[PDB]
Protein backbone atom coordinates (compact mmCIF):
# COMPACT_ATOMS: atom_id res chain seq x y z
CA UNK A 1 0.00 0.00 0.00
CA UNK A 2 1.22 3.57 -0.66
CA UNK A 3 1.95 4.07 3.05
CA UNK A 4 5.58 5.12 2.59
CA UNK A 5 4.66 8.52 1.13
CA UNK A 6 1.90 9.08 3.73
CA UNK A 7 3.40 8.01 7.06
CA UNK A 8 7.00 9.03 6.25
CA UNK A 9 6.25 12.35 4.53
CA UNK A 10 8.65 15.19 5.32
CA UNK A 11 5.85 17.67 6.10
CA UNK A 12 2.28 17.10 7.28
CA UNK A 13 -0.69 19.41 6.75
CA UNK A 14 -2.20 21.55 9.49
CA UNK A 15 -4.75 20.18 11.94
CA UNK A 16 -7.47 22.42 10.49
CA UNK A 17 -6.51 21.30 6.97
CA UNK A 18 -5.87 17.61 7.67
CA UNK A 19 -5.31 15.67 4.45
CA UNK A 20 -7.40 12.53 3.89
CA UNK A 21 -6.35 10.17 1.09
CA UNK A 22 -8.38 7.17 -0.04
CA UNK A 23 -6.43 3.90 0.00
CA UNK A 24 -7.69 0.96 -2.06
CA UNK A 25 -6.54 -1.95 -4.24
CA UNK A 26 -3.52 -2.91 -2.14
CA UNK A 27 -2.45 -5.29 0.62
CA UNK A 28 -1.64 -3.85 4.05
CA UNK A 29 0.83 -5.61 6.37
CA UNK A 30 -0.84 -5.32 9.77
CA UNK A 31 1.66 -7.86 11.12
CA UNK A 32 4.18 -5.00 11.22
CA UNK A 33 1.62 -2.98 13.18
CA UNK A 34 0.77 -5.51 15.88
CA UNK A 35 4.05 -7.50 16.01
CA UNK A 36 6.16 -4.36 16.56
CA UNK A 37 5.56 -1.29 18.72
CA UNK A 38 7.84 1.51 17.51
CA UNK A 39 4.65 3.57 17.86
CA UNK A 40 4.32 4.74 21.47
CA UNK A 41 0.51 4.90 21.40
CA UNK A 42 -1.70 2.17 19.91
CA UNK A 43 -5.33 2.63 21.01
CA UNK A 44 -7.98 0.53 19.25
CA UNK A 45 -11.66 0.69 20.20
CA UNK A 46 -14.33 -1.67 18.89
CA UNK A 47 -11.95 -3.93 16.94
CA UNK A 48 -9.39 -6.61 17.78
CA UNK A 49 -5.86 -6.38 16.32
CA UNK A 50 -5.72 -10.19 16.23
CA UNK A 51 -8.64 -10.49 13.78
CA UNK A 52 -7.27 -7.83 11.41
CA UNK A 53 -5.41 -10.46 9.37
CA UNK A 54 -8.42 -12.80 9.19
CA UNK A 55 -10.88 -10.06 8.17
CA UNK A 56 -11.29 -7.90 5.07
CA UNK A 57 -12.28 -4.24 5.41
CA UNK A 58 -13.71 -1.88 2.80
CA UNK A 59 -13.48 1.92 2.54
CA UNK A 60 -10.45 2.31 4.79
CA UNK A 61 -10.19 5.77 6.34
CA UNK A 62 -6.99 7.29 7.74
CA UNK A 63 -6.66 10.73 9.34
CA UNK A 64 -3.18 12.06 10.15
CA UNK A 65 -2.28 15.23 12.05
CA UNK A 66 0.21 16.60 14.59
CA UNK A 67 -0.74 17.50 18.17
CA UNK A 68 0.98 17.72 21.56
CA UNK A 69 1.47 15.02 24.17
CA UNK A 70 -0.86 16.10 26.97
CA UNK A 71 -3.94 16.25 24.69
CA UNK A 72 -3.88 12.47 24.13
CA UNK A 73 -5.94 12.11 27.33
CA UNK A 74 -8.82 14.26 26.06
CA UNK A 75 -9.38 12.06 22.97
CA UNK A 76 -11.15 9.22 24.78
CA UNK A 77 -14.76 8.11 25.35
CA UNK A 78 -16.40 9.61 28.42
CA UNK A 79 -13.91 12.47 28.80
CA UNK A 80 -14.28 16.24 29.12
CA UNK A 81 -12.04 19.11 28.13
CA UNK A 82 -11.77 22.38 26.26
CA UNK A 83 -10.83 20.75 22.95
CA UNK A 84 -13.46 17.99 23.01
CA UNK A 85 -16.20 20.52 23.79
CA UNK A 86 -15.37 23.71 21.87
CA UNK A 87 -13.10 22.47 19.05
CA UNK A 88 -14.19 19.00 17.88
CA UNK A 89 -16.46 16.36 19.42
CA UNK A 90 -15.97 12.65 18.68
CA UNK A 91 -18.72 10.03 19.09
CA UNK A 92 -18.71 7.96 22.26
CA UNK A 93 -19.23 4.78 20.19
CA UNK A 94 -16.33 5.58 17.85
CA UNK A 95 -14.81 2.44 16.32
CA UNK A 96 -11.25 2.41 15.01
CA UNK A 97 -7.63 2.72 16.07
CA UNK B 1 0.02 29.04 21.78
CA UNK B 2 2.02 25.95 20.87
CA UNK B 3 5.58 25.90 22.19
CA UNK B 4 7.99 23.94 19.98
CA UNK B 5 11.65 24.61 20.78
CA UNK B 6 14.81 22.47 20.80
CA UNK B 7 15.55 23.64 24.36
CA UNK B 8 12.00 22.98 25.60
CA UNK B 9 11.20 20.04 27.83
CA UNK B 10 10.78 16.65 26.21
CA UNK B 11 7.09 16.88 27.12
CA UNK B 12 6.28 19.72 24.72
CA UNK B 13 7.59 17.82 21.68
CA UNK B 14 5.08 17.40 18.83
CA UNK B 15 3.41 14.04 18.26
CA UNK B 16 2.26 12.53 14.97
CA UNK B 17 -1.23 11.06 15.40
CA UNK B 18 -2.77 8.72 12.82
CA UNK B 19 -6.35 7.52 13.35
CA UNK B 20 -7.83 4.66 11.32
CA UNK B 21 -11.61 4.90 10.94
CA UNK B 22 -13.99 2.06 10.06
CA UNK B 23 -17.48 2.83 8.76
CA UNK B 24 -20.22 0.21 8.48
CA UNK B 25 -12.83 -5.80 0.09
CA UNK B 26 -10.03 -4.27 -1.97
CA UNK B 27 -7.64 -4.38 1.01
CA UNK B 28 -7.17 -7.51 3.14
CA UNK B 29 -4.52 -9.23 5.24
CA UNK B 30 -0.92 -9.81 4.08
CA UNK B 31 -1.89 -12.98 2.13
CA UNK B 32 -1.82 -16.62 3.24
Amino acid at each position, epitope marked *: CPFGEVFNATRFASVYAWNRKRISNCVADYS*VL*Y*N*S*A*SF*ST*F*KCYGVSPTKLNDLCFTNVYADSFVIR*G*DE*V*RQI*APGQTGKIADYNYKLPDDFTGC | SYGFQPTN*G*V*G*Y*QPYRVVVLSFELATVCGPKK
Partner: antibody
Amino acid sequence: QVQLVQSGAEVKKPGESLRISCKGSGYSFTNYWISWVRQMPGKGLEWMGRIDPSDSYINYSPSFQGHATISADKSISTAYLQWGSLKASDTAMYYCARGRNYLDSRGRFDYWGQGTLVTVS
Amino acid sequence: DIVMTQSPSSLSASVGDRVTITCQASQDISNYLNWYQQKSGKAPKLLIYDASNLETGVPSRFSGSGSGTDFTFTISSLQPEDIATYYCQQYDSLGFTFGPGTKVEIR
Protein backbone atom coordinates in the same frame (compact mmCIF):
# COMPACT_ATOMS: atom_id res chain seq x y z
CA GLN C 1 15.15 9.96 49.72
CA VAL C 2 12.56 8.23 47.53
CA GLN C 3 12.41 4.48 48.20
CA LEU C 4 10.12 1.89 46.62
CA VAL C 5 9.54 -1.38 48.48
CA GLN C 6 7.50 -4.25 47.05
CA SER C 7 5.52 -6.93 48.87
CA GLY C 8 7.20 -10.12 50.01
CA ALA C 9 7.00 -13.57 48.48
CA GLU C 10 3.52 -15.13 48.55
CA VAL C 11 2.69 -18.84 48.32
CA LYS C 12 -0.94 -19.82 47.77
CA LYS C 13 -2.84 -23.04 47.13
CA PRO C 14 -4.31 -23.66 43.66
CA GLY C 15 -7.78 -22.23 43.11
CA GLU C 16 -7.21 -19.24 45.42
CA SER C 17 -7.10 -15.58 44.42
CA LEU C 18 -3.97 -13.55 45.14
CA ARG C 19 -3.44 -9.79 44.80
CA ILE C 20 -0.01 -8.16 44.71
CA SER C 21 0.67 -4.46 45.20
CA CYS C 22 3.31 -1.97 44.08
CA LYS C 23 3.27 1.49 45.66
CA GLY C 24 4.80 4.67 44.25
CA SER C 25 5.33 7.85 46.23
CA GLY C 26 7.00 11.24 45.97
CA TYR C 27 5.65 11.86 42.45
CA SER C 28 2.50 11.89 40.35
CA PHE C 29 1.66 8.19 40.15
CA THR C 30 -0.80 8.59 37.26
CA ASN C 31 1.66 10.73 35.25
CA TYR C 32 4.22 7.89 35.01
CA TRP C 33 3.80 4.48 33.42
CA ILE C 34 4.24 1.46 35.70
CA SER C 35 6.08 -1.45 34.06
CA TRP C 36 5.68 -5.11 35.01
CA VAL C 37 8.22 -7.83 34.19
CA ARG C 38 7.72 -11.58 34.65
CA GLN C 39 10.38 -14.30 34.92
CA MET C 40 10.01 -18.04 35.33
CA PRO C 41 12.63 -19.32 37.81
CA GLY C 42 15.48 -20.99 35.97
CA LYS C 43 14.66 -19.06 32.78
CA GLY C 44 14.78 -15.56 31.31
CA LEU C 45 12.44 -12.60 31.59
CA GLU C 46 9.14 -12.29 29.73
CA TRP C 47 8.01 -8.67 29.34
CA MET C 48 4.21 -8.71 29.58
CA GLY C 49 3.11 -5.07 29.48
CA ARG C 50 2.74 -1.74 31.26
CA ILE C 51 -0.38 0.17 32.31
CA ASP C 52 -1.03 3.91 32.58
CA PRO C 53 -3.19 4.78 35.62
CA SER C 54 -4.57 7.75 33.66
CA ASP C 55 -6.90 5.57 31.57
CA SER C 56 -6.12 2.01 32.79
CA TYR C 57 -5.23 1.02 29.23
CA ILE C 58 -4.06 -2.60 29.13
CA ASN C 59 -1.51 -3.91 26.61
CA TYR C 60 -0.93 -7.66 26.33
CA SER C 61 2.12 -9.72 25.47
CA PRO C 62 1.80 -11.71 22.22
CA SER C 63 1.57 -14.92 24.28
CA PHE C 64 -1.43 -13.62 26.25
CA GLN C 65 -4.45 -15.83 26.89
CA GLY C 66 -6.79 -13.33 28.59
CA HIS C 67 -6.78 -15.16 31.92
CA ALA C 68 -5.24 -12.27 33.88
CA THR C 69 -6.44 -8.66 33.83
CA ILE C 70 -4.73 -5.53 35.16
CA SER C 71 -6.58 -2.98 37.29
CA ALA C 72 -5.38 0.16 39.05
CA ASP C 73 -6.95 2.28 41.79
CA LYS C 74 -6.72 6.05 41.35
CA SER C 75 -8.02 6.81 44.86
CA ILE C 76 -4.86 5.56 46.61
CA SER C 77 -2.42 5.87 43.66
CA THR C 78 -1.30 2.25 44.12
CA ALA C 79 -0.84 -0.35 41.39
CA TYR C 80 -2.39 -3.79 41.81
CA LEU C 81 -2.36 -7.10 39.94
CA GLN C 82 -4.97 -9.79 40.59
CA TRP C 83 -5.34 -13.45 39.62
CA GLY C 84 -8.85 -14.87 39.86
CA SER C 85 -7.64 -18.48 39.67
CA LEU C 86 -3.97 -19.21 40.34
CA LYS C 87 -2.40 -21.97 38.23
CA ALA C 88 1.05 -23.42 37.58
CA SER C 89 2.01 -20.73 35.06
CA ASP C 90 1.47 -18.01 37.69
CA THR C 91 4.51 -19.28 39.64
CA ALA C 92 7.17 -16.62 39.01
CA MET C 93 8.64 -13.42 40.43
CA TYR C 94 7.54 -9.99 39.22
CA TYR C 95 9.30 -6.62 38.99
CA CYS C 96 7.43 -3.31 39.14
CA ALA C 97 9.22 -0.22 37.84
CA ARG C 98 8.44 3.34 36.81
CA GLY C 99 8.39 3.33 33.01
CA ARG C 100 9.05 6.18 30.63
CA ASN C 101 6.98 9.28 31.25
CA TYR C 102 4.13 9.70 28.78
CA LEU C 103 5.73 13.03 27.81
CA ASP C 104 9.17 11.59 26.99
CA SER C 105 9.93 9.38 23.99
CA ARG C 106 13.24 7.70 24.93
CA GLY C 107 12.18 4.63 26.87
CA ARG C 108 13.53 3.97 30.35
CA PHE C 109 12.59 2.10 33.52
CA ASP C 110 14.42 4.27 36.02
CA TYR C 111 14.38 2.31 39.27
CA TRP C 112 14.69 -1.38 40.17
CA GLY C 113 12.80 -2.95 43.06
CA GLN C 114 13.63 -6.14 44.91
CA GLY C 115 10.84 -8.03 43.14
CA THR C 116 7.85 -10.03 44.37
CA LEU C 117 7.83 -13.83 44.08
CA VAL C 118 4.49 -15.57 43.48
CA THR C 119 4.33 -19.34 44.00
CA VAL C 120 1.30 -21.56 43.41
CA SER C 121 1.35 -24.96 45.13
CA ASP D 1 6.55 -18.90 7.81
CA ILE D 2 9.34 -16.88 9.45
CA VAL D 3 12.80 -18.29 8.71
CA MET D 4 15.79 -16.31 10.00
CA THR D 5 19.42 -17.46 10.12
CA GLN D 6 22.58 -16.24 11.83
CA SER D 7 25.92 -16.38 10.01
CA PRO D 8 28.73 -17.03 10.44
CA SER D 9 28.06 -19.61 13.16
CA SER D 10 31.73 -20.38 13.89
CA LEU D 11 34.77 -18.13 13.49
CA SER D 12 38.48 -18.84 13.83
CA ALA D 13 41.02 -16.08 14.50
CA SER D 14 44.34 -15.53 16.21
CA VAL D 15 44.85 -14.15 19.71
CA GLY D 16 43.88 -10.48 19.99
CA ASP D 17 41.58 -10.42 16.95
CA ARG D 18 38.10 -8.91 17.06
CA VAL D 19 35.06 -11.20 16.80
CA THR D 20 31.66 -9.67 15.97
CA ILE D 21 28.33 -11.50 15.77
CA THR D 22 25.28 -10.09 13.99
CA CYS D 23 21.65 -11.15 14.38
CA GLN D 24 18.86 -9.65 12.28
CA ALA D 25 15.08 -9.67 12.69
CA SER D 26 12.26 -9.58 10.15
CA GLN D 27 12.11 -5.76 10.32
CA ASP D 28 14.07 -2.88 11.80
CA ILE D 29 14.33 -3.02 15.60
CA SER D 30 16.12 0.35 16.09
CA ASN D 31 18.30 -0.06 19.24
CA TYR D 32 16.14 -2.51 21.23
CA LEU D 33 18.97 -4.80 22.31
CA ASN D 34 20.08 -6.29 25.63
CA TRP D 35 22.85 -8.68 26.67
CA TYR D 36 22.26 -11.81 28.77
CA GLN D 37 24.90 -13.87 30.57
CA GLN D 38 23.96 -17.52 31.10
CA LYS D 39 25.79 -19.68 33.63
CA SER D 40 25.73 -23.47 33.73
CA GLY D 41 23.98 -23.76 37.09
CA LYS D 42 22.30 -20.36 37.06
CA ALA D 43 19.53 -18.66 35.09
CA PRO D 44 20.14 -15.62 32.86
CA LYS D 45 19.35 -12.29 34.50
CA LEU D 46 19.15 -8.84 32.94
CA LEU D 47 21.80 -6.50 34.36
CA ILE D 48 21.85 -3.43 32.08
CA TYR D 49 18.66 -2.42 30.28
CA ASP D 50 18.31 0.11 27.42
CA ALA D 51 22.16 0.21 27.36
CA SER D 52 21.94 3.61 29.08
CA ASN D 53 20.71 2.86 32.63
CA LEU D 54 23.15 1.29 35.11
CA GLU D 55 21.92 -0.40 38.27
CA THR D 56 24.04 0.09 41.38
CA GLY D 57 26.58 -2.70 41.78
CA VAL D 58 26.41 -3.84 38.14
CA PRO D 59 29.91 -4.14 36.61
CA SER D 60 30.70 -1.85 33.69
CA ARG D 61 32.16 -4.69 31.58
CA PHE D 62 28.75 -5.11 29.90
CA SER D 63 27.83 -2.52 27.27
CA GLY D 64 25.82 -2.17 24.08
CA SER D 65 25.86 0.15 21.09
CA GLY D 66 24.62 0.41 17.53
CA SER D 67 21.26 0.86 15.84
CA GLY D 68 19.44 -0.11 12.66
CA THR D 69 20.82 -3.29 11.11
CA ASP D 70 24.53 -3.05 12.02
CA PHE D 71 25.76 -3.77 15.55
CA THR D 72 29.29 -3.92 16.98
CA PHE D 73 30.47 -5.52 20.23
CA THR D 74 33.64 -4.35 21.99
CA ILE D 75 35.33 -6.08 24.93
CA SER D 76 36.89 -3.72 27.46
CA SER D 77 38.85 -6.58 29.04
CA LEU D 78 38.57 -10.25 28.07
CA GLN D 79 38.19 -12.59 31.04
CA PRO D 80 38.32 -16.39 31.37
CA GLU D 81 34.86 -16.33 33.00
CA ASP D 82 33.33 -14.42 30.07
CA ILE D 83 32.28 -17.62 28.28
CA ALA D 84 28.49 -17.59 27.83
CA THR D 85 25.75 -17.70 25.20
CA TYR D 86 24.85 -14.35 23.64
CA TYR D 87 21.25 -13.93 22.45
CA CYS D 88 20.06 -11.24 20.06
CA GLN D 89 17.18 -9.61 21.90
CA GLN D 90 14.50 -7.44 20.28
CA TYR D 91 11.57 -6.08 22.27
CA ASP D 92 8.80 -3.48 22.14
CA SER D 93 6.06 -1.95 24.29
CA LEU D 94 3.67 -4.78 23.38
CA GLY D 95 5.80 -7.83 24.20
CA PHE D 96 8.98 -9.80 23.59
CA THR D 97 10.25 -12.52 21.24
CA PHE D 98 13.10 -14.93 21.96
CA GLY D 99 15.59 -15.43 19.15
CA PRO D 100 17.02 -18.83 18.22
CA GLY D 101 20.39 -17.84 19.67
CA THR D 102 23.95 -18.84 18.81
CA LYS D 103 26.12 -20.98 21.09
CA VAL D 104 29.76 -19.83 20.98
CA GLU D 105 32.42 -21.37 23.22
CA ILE D 106 35.94 -20.01 23.77
CA ARG D 107 38.74 -22.25 25.02
